[PDB]
Structure formats: C-alpha cells, structure tokens
Design a protein around this ligand. Structure first.
Ligand SMILES: *[C@@H]1O[C@H](CO)[C@@H](O[C@@H]2O[C@H](CO)[C@@H](O)[C@H](O)[C@H]2NC(C)=O)[C@H](O)[C@H]1NC(C)=O
Lengths: 49, 36, 49, 128, 49
C-alpha cells in the first residue's frame, strides 16, 4: 500500500520540492537586480560610457 | 464661408457597459508563454 | 562578434531561428529580461544571440 | 435657454453639515464646468470649487480642503455640494455659475471663457 | 519597509523605487520567521490526538 499512498497524493514529497523552489527563486532576484539605476541615469555601462 | 448647423440642443446622450475592451500592446517586445 | 542592431549593443554568436514575430515587434526577451532574438532591419529576418 | 435653479434657504447649528443642489435645464450639461461661488454679507466673492460631469474629478480650493465635496448626477442632471464641520463664519450666499468652454489637459482644469449664466442664491445661516 | 523609510511622502517613495526589490526580501524573511514560530509549538505540545 506504500506505492498507492505515494502516487495518489501529489504533495507527499513536499520537503524535497521546497529547497529547489527556494534556491532557484533567490537566484532570479539576483539577475533582475542588473536593471536598476541605483541613482544613476541608466543601467547600461556601454550606454553611459 | 462657414454655415451654422446646430439648433435646439436637447436630451443628453446615453450610457453603455464596456465589458473588457480597450487593451493595446504596450511596447514592441516579443514574448511567448509568459505572464507580464 | 560585437553587434549594434539599431540601438542594441552586445557580444555573441548569431544564427537562424524558427520563431515568428508579429509584423511590428523588433526583438525578444527571456524570463530574466535578457535579450534573446533580434530582427535584421534590412532583410527582416530573425536571428538568435 | 440654459437655466439653473437651486434649493431653498437653510438655518443650521454649529457642528452640522449642509448640502445644496443645482439643477440645470436646457443644455448638454455634460461638457460644461460647474463652479461654486460664495459671497459673505458686505464682502466680496470667493471661489470654492468646480467639476466637469463627463470627467468625474473635481478641483478644490486649498482653504476648503477636506471640508467640502462636489459631485454630479448625469441622469437627473444635478450638481451637489456638501459642506461639513460648520463654523459661525460659514454664513453667506452661494451661487452656481457655469463656464461654457473648459478643457482638461492633465489632471488639472483649463478655462477659456468667463462665467455667463448664474444661479439665484441660497442663504445658509449658522447660529444657535 | 516603505512606511518605515519614507513616511507618507510621495517624493520619497518615488526615489525609493530606483533601488529594486530590497523591501520584499525583508518582508518575506520576517513572514517566514513568523510562520516557523507556530510549527515550533505544534511539534512540541501536539503529541496526542
Ligand atoms: C533595403 O534596401 C535593400 C537594397 O535594395 C533591399 O534589398 C533588396 O530588396 C529587393 C526587393 O525585391 C531584393 O530583390 C534584393 O535581392 C535585395 N537585396 C539586394 C538588392 O542586394 C531591402 O529589401 C531594403 N529593405 C527594405 C525594408 O525595404
């Protein structure tokens, strides 16, 4: 009966599919921080240069 | 060379529902299978 | 190589594509808001980066 | 043939609120600018606010901020002005007036003509 | 975050918008701590049904 309990319920492996979501999302916020003025006039180095 | 047209202005217009109308493309960027 | 497509600067390798643009869109973007494809102003063909 | 009529006189006690109505008949009323003017006894005239019914956003004077409210009803074609937190200095005569040529541009208002048709006057006496 | 830094000022809140998503991360971390504080008690006292 273990196979039925694991297969029927989809949220059984919620602990393992919880560090994948946390690790990936924290990565995205990094990349999206490359498009901020931070007080300058543009976010592109070659444009201002 | 103008001509007067309007005469005896009367009852104001009517009103209608709009539902979900009046959406336009905000920019010129191609996106696929995404929510923006 | 280095490319300057009508105002878009960058470095990389270009190749053909299978994507289809609506006939007013110029370039495309990825999930993290990074440019992925462009359109040649003179030949109106889609290229990857 | 555009004419505006107001309600009757009012006597009030301090701390209450009043509401005056203005009914205009004979015109479009949709693209006008309906104003409000106050005249104290033995004094001059003052500006309170105005509204364009089709847009739906009024403009208020700085002195009467948070104390007055101007609204309009297009179906019955009638403009309401409500004044709250009454004092003893709010005893005067109120006039409707109408600016025929008004535009918007940004969130503000722009006028290209003076008021030509006026109301009649409603006296509001506040005392105890 | 927004009310702590710029108290009900529109010109301060418009300048704060150029720094990206710094406040959302703080709100998320505090929410996570607050959520963990209840599992802490549940795992200790609720041992009989
Ligand atoms: C920009 O000009 C070039 C040069 O004429 C155009 O390229 C030619 O277009 C004709 C159109 O029938 C083709 O037959 C040629 O083979 C193209 N290449 C040449 C002549 O070398 C190009 O189409 C123009 N771009 C736009 C958007 O009109």
């Amino acid at each position: 009966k273990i196979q039925d309990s694991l297969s029927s319920t989809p949220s059984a492996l919620g602990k393992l599919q919880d560090v994948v979501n946390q690790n990936a999302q924290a990565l995205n916020t990094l990349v999206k921080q490359l498009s901020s003025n931070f007080g300058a006039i543009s976010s592109v180095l070659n444009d201002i240069l | 060379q103008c001509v007067n047209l309007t005469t005896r202005t009367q009852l104001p217009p009517a009103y209608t529902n709009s539902f979900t109308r009046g959406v336009y493309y905000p920019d010129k960027v191609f996106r696929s299978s995404v929510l923006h | 190589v280095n490319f300057n497509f009508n105002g878009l600067t960058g470095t990389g390798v270009l190749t053909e594509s299978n994507k289809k643009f609506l006939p007013f869109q110029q370039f495309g973007r990825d999930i993290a808001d990074t440019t992925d494809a462009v359109r040649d102003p003179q030949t109106l063909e889609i290229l990857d980066i | 043939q555009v004419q505006l009529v107001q309600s009757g006189a009012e006597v009030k006690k301090p701390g209450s609120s009043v509401k005056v109505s203005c009914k205009a008949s004979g015109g479009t009323f949709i693209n006008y600018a309906v104003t409000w003017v106050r005249q104290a006894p033995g004094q001059g005239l003052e500006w309170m606010g105005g509204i364009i019914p089709i847009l739906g956003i009024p403009n208020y004077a700085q002195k009467f901020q948070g104390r007055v409210t101007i609204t309009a009803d297009k179906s019955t074609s009638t403009a309401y002005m409500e004044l709250s937190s009454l004092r003893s200095e709010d005893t005067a005569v109120y006039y409707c007036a109408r600016v025929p040529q008004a535009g918007a541009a940004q969130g503000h208002y722009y006028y290209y003509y003076g008021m030509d048709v006026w109301g009649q006057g409603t006296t509001v006496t506040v005392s105890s | 975050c927004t009310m702590y830094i710029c108290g009900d000022s529109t010109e301060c809140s418009n300048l704060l918008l150029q720094y990206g998503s710094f406040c959302t991360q703080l709100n998320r971390a505090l929410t996570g701590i607050a959520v963990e504080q209840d599992k802490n008690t549940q795992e200790v006292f609720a041992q009989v049904k």
